[PDB]
Every structure is written in structure tokens, then in C-alpha cells.
Design a protein around this ligand. Structure first.
Ligand SMILES: CCCCCCCCO[C@@H]1O[C@H](CO)[C@@H](O)[C@H](O)[C@H]1O
Ligand SMILES: CCCCCCCCO[C@@H]1O[C@H](CO)[C@@H](O)[C@H](O)[C@H]1O
Ligand SMILES: CCCCCCCCO[C@@H]1O[C@H](CO)[C@@H](O)[C@H](O)[C@H]1O
Ligand SMILES: CCCCCCCCCCC
Ligand SMILES: [Cl-]
Ligand SMILES: [Cl-]
Ligand code: NA
Ligand code: NA
Ligand code: NA
Ligand code: NA
Lengths: 428, 434
């Protein structure tokens, strides 16, 4: 009464005959057009589909190194499946339930931020942030100048370059970027929001792709020129030590802390402190500060801090490929890229991203940060689109541990862009 | 004084929990909370934590009623009844439970983790003796339940649905909860009317399963031929462990258990909806198909022992770290307080006790015929079915001083518990057909 025994070769921990069973199930669901629009239905598809295009992206000879590898193959194959029509409407719905309705994206980011920040030493927190802010500024200045120089060459005035190209790309992505950008444009120029948003969303999305490619490239550069890489680390020589016994309970507390620290940040940002100075504070920017305060407070035992890291490790190593399926489906839209895929737009955007890379490399190097991780966090993770872009880039360069800096770039840096945007939109 | 701040609420030291509690209070009074997985889990973690810890430390509650999970769903139901929850808080819990369907995932994980945790060889050996002995206990509990039900003027369909099947089910979250979904899927009636009655009868029966366990031991000493004190069979002559070599255990294997849980559900879902939506006139619910599927997956040997252990680890995480979250949801979506109180009847106590008796009569007879000792059989295949899942097994075996039979009680709670889900689907469907 035995069909088989386990084979040798594994796909996502699953030997071929076992993965076959899973794949067949997904094929049955597909052809019979039957899948629950749930976490169960979503995760079922996302796991199985993520598993196959992950192992392929991990083994594709030229692709794995200079393109982001496994997560980028998944990210692109899934985006293609939507564009082509290979996905059922309800398969799309199932993935959308997970990523947007259930908000697995926010859960994913919140778990990672909590694991990253609670794992660091208290004395190290405030100093990193103080050195990270001017590093962001250099990336903006770098992205601006490169976009202007490439702008005038194509016969593009300064305004169109800053308003339609630089700011959307360097802004906080979609919801907290192109959308409030679309407001200010309409709230000043008086034109339609759609004419700005449609252009902005298409431009920054192209730049997002380049930021993903460049991330994989900068990872290679850092192995070629070791002196430039922190090999994951951003701060020079930086990371209660008593790693006690660790139970499932302490890992569960990590999820308690991740969701609770988000909840507090949500309340503060939506009801208590929506804007400090002229700058608005996204709830993920508030969450970074809250987790930092929770670290500095001393309220978390090192076994609980270890639990938050262990959960963050489960997510980033076991649910990453699932997430990339959802991000490829929900936050790409290949058509909007192609409808704007003018090799004038491609060049301006790509150069602007390079401008952010160069500026942030220069900035952090002056600060005392590693040149490679400076251009990825304060450069690429500004020129990408929000948290979805942060997870694409950091997975492509295999630096998911830098999620907190990336979020400071996406949220706090994107809010800074908003201020600049309000000015540039006003004067001219 | 400093002794106090060392006290833990769900793994959180008292000052750290206060932070989490203050956070929930601020969200409540500013009326601000995301109605997604983040806001929901935060609410359900914090709320489940405090009332779970209170539930554990109330004497009659922990020993008789069910402790933490019971206190949680009762209090969460009270928050709805008394309008303590805001609308957003109710939306957040409901969205997690039904819209995101964290309930199906939870049940999918439990079923997968429980059945795959079973040794393959032991699984097949059970089909020749121990599983039939389990079936006899269900038949026994059925016959006794119908009769006592009749004497009280309770129809057969209600006795089977609200009394017998929950009692012989795999407890609360592994029995009454998935039984409510199957009921609602076949009947069309609210799951709240099923669960609220089922969980009360469950709790009463579990008490009698413990009391009878002690009695069966006292009987086993007086009638020594019934006992074979300690052992179930007559040949093995050694109890400790016989294993499948499980070595490495990483996050990858537990994540595979998540793949298997979510994929085995998908297969059971397609079968129930598009492939085999009705064998006979009987519609088999996907929870029932999943039991058969997951049991089959174990039989095929396709899964490595390291992956089986990964499924069990994920199952253990959900059942010990996420159960208190689920019970907040259970109280909000499955609980009618009046239906529970109305079920707390001396009549229901009597019916419950006799159903449990029927389980020990059925399992003794059927076990006597197969080659098992009557006393132990009635304890392992009778009482450890009639009790409240794994927690009940520990209470029952403690009362009869037979913790060595724990492997057999595990088969009852897991295999026989999923089998009840299959029987229930078949029985529920047959009852609505005219
Ligand atoms: C390995 C995958 C085998 C797939 C076999 C099932 C093929 C689908 O089967 C059919 O799909 C039709 C839609 O095209 C439906 O209308 C039918 O109800 C269904 O039977
Ligand atoms: C306001 C507080 C700012 C927090 C900055 C991010 C800290 C969490 O990020 C951590 O940074 C560490 C050193 O910087 C690195 O060693 C870790 O890999 C990274 O996870
Ligand atoms: C007499 C009018 C019909 C009965 C109205 C009261 C029904 C219960 O309604 C309300 O339930 C909640 C729980 O106590 C509380 O908010 C109120 O005290 C109670 O009035
Ligand atoms: C939707 C919640 C995802 C569950 C993740 C469980 C992580 C358990 C880690 C066990 C080592
Ligand atoms: Cl709100
Ligand atoms: Cl309200
Ligand atoms: Na951006
Ligand atoms: Na970003
Ligand atoms: Na039971
Ligand atoms: Na049991």
C-alpha cells in the first residue's frame, strides 16, 4: 500500500513526487475553476507557483546573478500570468484577498521591522537614524541632477523632469507617493488627477524594475569589490545577550509585538500625530520609531527579541516566494508599463535611479556607512515603489535585514519628497 | 513586589503586556483599527491573552469547564452582547475569521498536522483492530443516545447532530468548530445554534469521561479478567516507543507542512465542489474529504519523516499559540450565550452521561471481540473519544493511571476525531434528505 518513497531532488523542501502531488492539485483547481478566495486558496497557489519559479530563478545561469534571481523570476512570471490571462479571475481574487484585503503585505513588513529592530543593540538605534537622514537627501539630490542632465538632452524642461519624473520615482511609491503627488498637482495646477497619476504610476513602475535589476548588480559589485560591501551590514562594526531557551511562545510574542506595534503606529498616525512640522508621518514610519522605543525601553527580554527574529526569519525565508507571487500580481501591471515604455522614458527613469545610487553612495560614504548598502537603502529603496518595491529590491540583493532602513526611505523619505513636491509644484 | 512584574501574560512579562494592553485601549477609544490581519490579530492576541490567563487560574473553570479557550469565547461573546466591542473591532475579528478565512486555514493545519504526525505503520495497523474498536464505541454511544433521547422526547436527528457527534468529536476547535461548518453547509442553519449547544454537551460529557475513567479503574481491580491492568493487547509485552527516524528539523520542513495543509485542503475543496460533489444523494464536506486525503497521503509514504514532523510542529504552533486568537473569533462568530445556558439542563447532563456510557459499552464489546482488554479498550477507544480532544486524553488517562496508552488516545483524538467529521457529513446529509 505504498505509491512511492521520497525521491532525492527537492523543490522548496519537497521531493519531486511530493511536489508533483501539490502541482497536480493546483492544476485540478485551475481546470475545474475551483479555488477559495481565502488565505488557504491564495497560499496554496502562491506556495506551489512560488516553489517552481523560485528553483528555476535560482538555477538560471545568467539570471540568478545579475537579475535578482529566484524572487525576481517569480515576481515577473506572476506579473506575466496576469498580463497574458493564464490566471483565472478567482485565482487573481484569491491572491488579492491575501495581499490587499487581508493585507499580508503589511503583516509581512511589520513582522520584519519588528524582528530587525528588536535584534539590534539599544545604543546603536538613534545614531543610525541621524546618519541615515542626510544619506537619503544625497540620494535625492543625486537623483534630481542626473534626471535634469538627462532631461535637457531629450529636450525636456526642468519642470516636467522634476514634476513627472524625479519626484514620483523618488517618492514613497504608489499609495503614499503618486497618489498624494496627484493631489498637490491637481490642488495647484487645477488639472485632472488622472493625467498625473497615470503618468506617475507608469514612470515609477519602470524605475522600480531598474531598481530591482541594479540591486542584483550592486550585490555582484560588492562581491567583486569586497571593500565596498558590508556583506549585509550598513553600519561600521555593528551587531542583555543571554540567548535563553526559545519556545514557540516567544515566537508567538514576536507576532503579538509585530501586530501590536503596528496598531499603535496606526492609531498615532491616523488620530494623534498625522504630521510633524510640514512633513507627514506614514504609519510604517511611526512603527519604526515605536519598535525602537520598545527596544530602548528594556521591556522586551532577549528571549522575546530572539522570538521576533525567529518569526522574521520564518517569513523572509519561507513566505518570501509566496509574497513575490502576490506582489507580481497586485503591484506591477505590465500593461501600464508598456503603454509608457517609450525608450525616452526608459532612459530618463533608469538614469535617475543611477543618480540616486551615486548620490546615496557618496552620502553614506561621507557619513561612514558602507557604499554598497548606502546606495541600496537610501538610493534604490527610495527610487523603488514603497514597501512592495522594498521587498523586491532587498530580496534581489539578498539584504532583507535592511528592511527597516528601506522603510525609513519609503515612508520618511517619501514624505520629504512630498514637501519638495509641494514647493516645485507651486513656484513654476 | 518585583515578584509580581515577573508574572507572564501569554509569554509577555506584566509590564510588556501593559504596553500591548494600553495600545488596544488607545485603538478602542480613538476608534482606530485596520480591519485586516494586522489589526485583527493584535486585538485577538491581546484580548485572548488576558482572558486565557484568567481562564487557566479559575479552579472550577480549568478542571471542569475547559479553562482558557472556553473563558475566551464566552467573554468575546459577552463583549458583543453588551456592546463593549466597537463595530470596527467586530469587523476586524470577522474579517480574519471568515473573510480572510483564518478558520479554514486553522482547521486545515490541525487536520494535516494531526494525521501526518501518525506513524505510517501504526496508521495501517489501526485499520485492522483499533479503528473498528473506535467505530463500535460510536455505534454504542449512538444507540444509547437515541434511546435516552427518545425517553426525553428528543428526536433522532437532533440527538445525532447536537449530542452524540460533538461528544465523540475531537474536542472544541478540532470538533465542535468544524462540525458547525459542516452542519451549516448541509443544513443551511446558523453555525451559532449548532456550536453553542454542542460545546455545552461536550463539556458535560468530558467530565463524565473523567469520572468513568476512575470508576473503570476501580472496576478493573475488582474484576481482574476485564483489566490486564495497564495494557491493551496481550502479545507486545513492552511499552515505550517504536519510531520513524526523525532527524533534521528546520523552518523549511514546517513551511512544507504549511504547503501540505493548504494544498490538501485545496484538493478536498475541488473534489467536494467539481469532481465528486455528491456520492449518492450524500454530499461530503471538504473537511471530511481532507481527512481521507491527508490519511491517504500518509499511507502513500510520499512524505519524509522530517516533513511529517514539520506538519506536527506547525500544528503545535497553531494549537498552542494561535488557539486563543481563534477563540476570540469563535466567541464573535459561533457563540450564542442564550443557547449555551439553555443547554445547561439536568436533562442534558443525563443524556450526556449515558451517551458516554454507551461509548464504554460499545468499545468494550468490540474490543473484547478483536483481542483487546475490555477495560482499557473502553478507556482508549471509548472515553478518549468522548472526551475533549488531546487535553481530555491527559485528564482521562490521569484518572485511570494509564498514561502509557497515550499513543492510542492520540489515535482516537486525531484519526477517530477526523473520522467523526466524515461520519458527520454523511449523517448530516442523510438527515436533510426526505
Ligand atoms: C492534470 C489536470 C487534469 C485536468 C482534468 C480536468 C479538466 C477540466 O474538466 C472540465 O473542465 C471544464 C472547463 O474547461 C468544466 O466545464 C468541466 O466541468 C470539467 O469537468
Ligand atoms: C530609529 C531607529 C532606526 C533603526 C535602524 C534600523 C535598525 C534595525 O535594522 C538592523 O540594523 C542593524 C544595524 O544597523 C543591522 O545589523 C541589522 O541587520 C538590521 O536588521
Ligand atoms: C425593554 C425593551 C426590550 C429589552 C431591551 C434590553 C435588551 C438588551 O439590550 C441591551 O443589552 C446590553 C447588555 O446588557 C446593554 O447595552 C443594555 O444594558 C441592554 O439594554
Ligand atoms: C498567517 C500567519 C502565518 C503563520 C506563520 C506561522 C509561523 C510559525 C513558525 C514556526 C517555527
Ligand atoms: Cl480606522
Ligand atoms: Cl462603534
Ligand atoms: Na519611490
Ligand atoms: Na521604497
Ligand atoms: Na470527543
Ligand atoms: Na480524545
Amino acid at each position: 500500500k505504498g505509491a512511492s518513497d521520497l525521491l532525492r531532488f527537492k523543490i522548496f523542501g519537497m521531493p519531486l513526487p511530493l511536489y508533483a502531488f501539490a502541482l497536480i492539485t493546483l492544476l485540478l483547481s485551475h481546470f475545474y475553476n475551483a479555488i477559495p478566495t481565502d488565505l488557504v486558496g491564495g497560499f496554496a497557489l502562491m506556495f506551489v507557483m512560488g516553489a517552481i519559479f523560485g528553483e528555476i530563478g535560482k538555477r538560471l545561469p545568467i539570471f540568478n546573478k545579475y537579475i535578482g534571481g529566484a524572487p525576481v523570476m517569480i515576481f515577473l512570471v506572476a506579473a506575466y500570468f496576469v498580463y497574458a490571462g493564464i490566471f483565472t479571475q478567482k485565482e487573481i481574487d484569491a491572491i488579492s484577498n491575501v495581499m490587499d484585503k487581508s493585507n499580508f503585505l503589511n503583516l509581512f513588513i511589520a513582522v520584519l521591522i519588528t524582528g530587525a529592530i528588536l535584534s539590534v543593540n539599544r545604543k546603536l538605534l538613534l545614531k543610525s537614524l541621524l546618519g541615515y537622514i542626510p544619506t537619503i537627501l544625497a540620494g535625492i539630490v543625486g537623483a534630481s541632477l542626473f534626471g535634469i542632465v538627462i532631461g535637457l538632452c531629450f529636450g525636456i524642461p526642468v519642470d516636467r523632469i522634476m514634476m513627472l519624473y524625479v519626484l514620483p520615482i523618488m517618492g514613497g511609491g504608489n499609495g503614499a507617493g503618486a497618489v498624494p503627488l496627484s493631489e498637490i498637482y491637481h490642488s495647484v495646477t487645477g488639472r485632472s488627477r488622472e493625467e498625473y497619476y497615470s503618468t506617475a504610476i507608469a514612470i515609477l513602475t519602470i524605475a522600480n524594475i531598474f531598481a530591482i535589476i541594479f540591486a542584483a548588480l550592486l550585490d555582484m559589485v560588492g562581491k567583486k569589490y569586497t571593500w565596498l560591501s558590508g556583506e549585509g551590514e550598513l553600519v561600521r562594526k555593528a551587531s542583555d545577550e543571554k540567548a535563553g531557551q526559545i519556545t514557540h511562545r516567544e515566537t508567538a510574542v514576536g507576532m503579538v509585538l509585530s501586530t501590536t506595534c503596528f496598531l499603535l503606529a496606526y492609531v498615532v498616525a491616523k488620530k494623534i500625530l498625522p504630521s510633524i512640522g510640514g512633513v507627514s508621518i506614514h504609519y510604517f514610519a511611526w512603527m519604526v520609531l515605536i519598535v525602537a522605543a520598545l527596544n530602548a525601553s528594556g521591556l522586551c527580554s532577549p528571549e522575546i527579541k530572539a522570538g521576533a527574529k525567529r518569526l522574521s526569519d520564518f517569513f523572509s525565508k519561507q513566505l518570501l516566494w509566496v509574497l513575490m507571487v502576490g506582489v507580481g500580481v497586485c503591484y506591477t501591471d505590465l500593461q501600464e508599463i508598456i503603454d509608457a515604455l517609450t525608450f525616452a522614458n526608459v532612459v530618463i527613469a533608469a538614469i535617475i535611479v543611477v543618480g540616486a545610487v551615486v548620490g546615496a553612495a557618496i552620502g553614506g560614504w561621507l557619513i561612514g556607512f558602507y557604499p554598497i548598502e548606502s546606495s541600496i537603502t537610501a538610493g534604490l529603496c527610495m527610487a523603488n515603489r514603497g514597501g512592495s518595491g522594498d521587498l523586491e529590491v532587498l530580496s534581489a540583493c539578498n539584504r532583507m535585514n535592511l528592511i527597516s532602513y528601506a522603510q525609513i526611505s519609503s515612508r520618511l523619505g517619501g514624505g520629504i519628497v512630498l514637501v519638495i513636491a509641494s514647493i516645485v509644484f507651486s513656484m513654476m
